[PDB]
Design a binder for this molecule. Structure first.
Ligand SMILES: *[C@@H]1O[C@H](CO)[C@@H](O[C@@H]2O[C@H](CO)[C@@H](O)[C@H](O)[C@H]2NC(C)=O)[C@H](O)[C@H]1NC(C)=O
Ligand SMILES: *[C@@H]1O[C@H](CO)[C@@H](O[C@@H]2O[C@H](CO)[C@@H](O)[C@H](O)[C@H]2NC(C)=O)[C@H](O)[C@H]1NC(C)=O
Ligand SMILES: *[C@@H]1O[C@H](CO)[C@@H](O)[C@H](O)[C@H]1NC(C)=O
Ligand SMILES: *[C@@H]1O[C@H](CO)[C@@H](O)[C@H](O)[C@H]1NC(C)=O
Ligand SMILES: [Zn+2]
Lengths: 121, 129
């Protein structure tokens, strides 16, 4: 059910683009292919991607970002972050974007470069 | 070149230097206290020959290196506090430098990235008390 060299799991397809880029840049790449940065369903699909990338990269970009005006994290789908559903380690003193380390989820500079994972269905 | 002499096991020799590439990721502050522990420093390059090697050997992981700045405004400095003077400009708005697949970039202390250590060469051993 997945396009070639895309990895299926729990009715989404995933892809791990093989180049490190900024948050905005990653958003645009996925969004330009008829896909989106990750939108974390459950603490399972995190473990899956975390395995999938364990051999490749130490962290990756997900569709989640802190907007100094709101003082709110926001999934790239509109919805404010359900604070219960994810603990995010880092400073939120300036705009930030969420990258998923193997063991944590981090508040990063949005101009740092990172592996990103594309999501469809 | 005073003479030829190998780098210790798990290190890679390039010019008057020995390079190390960590196997697990960590934050910048720890990565340094680990290099220091090995009587070394967060990887520094002085030649092009060195930088070219770093860029190619790197592989899919990004690696922390020697460059810090006190802020977005102030200038880039190696572990020893020498100014960074080399015409590859470090990307990003941030205070701690690491190896992209597209050159060098910068992220916050607490980012989880592998790291590289550099040390100079010699056939017997001179100690940093
Ligand atoms: C935007 O995406 C997030 C998930 O990435 C949605 O919030 C989640 O919805 C699930 C499934 O219903 C809930 O069980 C969780 O509370 C939320 N997950 C997390 C990790 O917070 C959000 O509703 C999405 N918005 C839209 C328009 O679908
Ligand atoms: C950087 O990483 C080191 C190790 O990865 C962290 O040090 C650990 O901190 C906890 C409590 O803070 C201790 O119980 C661990 O045993 C420590 N490990 C070591 C090896 O020192 C450190 O907290 C991290 N720094 C930042 C800024 O996140
Ligand atoms: C992790 O990824 C590898 C490579 O795709 C795969 O072959 C393996 O089945 C996965 N392992 C786990 C523990 O999920
Ligand atoms: C700084 O860069 C310039 C390159 O034109 C060079 O002339 C100068 O020697 C460099 N600094 C040091 C410490 O060598
Ligand atoms: Zn010693």
């Amino acid at each position: 059910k997945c396009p070639k060299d895309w990895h299926s799991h729990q009715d989404k397809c995933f892809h791990v683009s093989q180049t490190s880029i900024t948050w905005k840049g990653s958003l645009a790449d996925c969004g330009g292919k008829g896909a989106t940065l990750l939108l974390v369903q459950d603490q399972e699909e995190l473990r899956f991607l975390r395995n999938l990338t364990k051999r490749i990269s130490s962290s990756f970009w997900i569709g989640l970002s802190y907007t100094l005006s709101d003082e709110k994290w926001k999934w790239i789908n509109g919805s404010t972050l359900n604070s219960d559903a994810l603990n995010i380690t880092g400073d939120t003193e300036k705009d930030s974007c969420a990258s998923v380390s193997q063991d944590k989820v981090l508040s990063e500079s949005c101009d740092s470069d990172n592996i990103w994972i594309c999501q469809k269905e | 070149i005073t003479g030829y002499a190998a780098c210790p096991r798990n290190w890679i020799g390039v010019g008057n230097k020995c390079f190390y590439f960590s196997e697990y990721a960590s934050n910048w502050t720890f990565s340094q206290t680990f290099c220091k522990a090995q009587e070394a420093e967060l990887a520094r390059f002085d030649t092009e020959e060195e930088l070219n090697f770093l860029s190619r050997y790197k592989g899919s992981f990004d690696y922390w290196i020697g460059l810090h700045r006190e802020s977005s405004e102030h200038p880039w400095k190696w572990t020893d506090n020498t100014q960074y003077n080399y015409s590859l400009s470090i990307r990003g708005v941030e205070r701690y430098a690491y190896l992209n697949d597209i050159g060098i970039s910068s992220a916050r202390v607490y980012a989880d990235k592998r790291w590289s250590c550099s040390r100079l060469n010699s056939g017997t051993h001179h100690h940093h008390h």
